[PDB]
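> tool_call: predict_assembly(chains=two)
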Amino acid sequence: MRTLLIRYILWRNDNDQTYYNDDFKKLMLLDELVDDGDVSTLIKNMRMTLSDGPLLDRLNYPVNNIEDAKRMIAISAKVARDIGERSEIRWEESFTILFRMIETYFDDLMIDLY
Amino acid sequence: MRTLLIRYILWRNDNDQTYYNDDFKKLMLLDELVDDGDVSTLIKNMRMTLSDGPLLDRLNYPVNNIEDAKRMIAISAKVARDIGERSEIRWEESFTILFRMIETYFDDLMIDLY
């Protein structure tokens, strides 16, 4: 789950066909859980501050249920997409926080998705 | 370079052909720079301690030249390979340290490799 999620988020960023996998299709369904307006707001802030700061702030939100986790994956995915591949983001820092929150839900997320 | 290296190390760990890229061939040539005996020693220690601790210790070594960086990538790659896919390693923590040391060499590593 850790690997798959890293691979998926990175893929959402650059859209490199050479790194696409069909397991991404299921994870892509989680996008409906996140409003595009929230993503736009987040991107605007990231650009305003020239940092992943606003993304890390969103990732530092509490995760109390699997739906909360699904949303964090989706927000990471849509931000990754919308920010653009040129964006010099230290992705491992975002993954550190994302997984710090969602790690426990990995077993259930895997069942829920596949 | 950050993305490519994340993708390469993760690929070395699971050997999933669906995540392979031709750019990995060049990075695989760096393996000659690292002795297999050092890797064996490191793996033995990781297993002894049930942690990535010994890997993180190796990654915390100083990087004074591009060859030092090339070796850190190679040690990360061979450890990733030899440890096995089942290994519950928080890869992002290893990437945090690896990139903390090698980040500056990214531009030169890219030229040197491609």
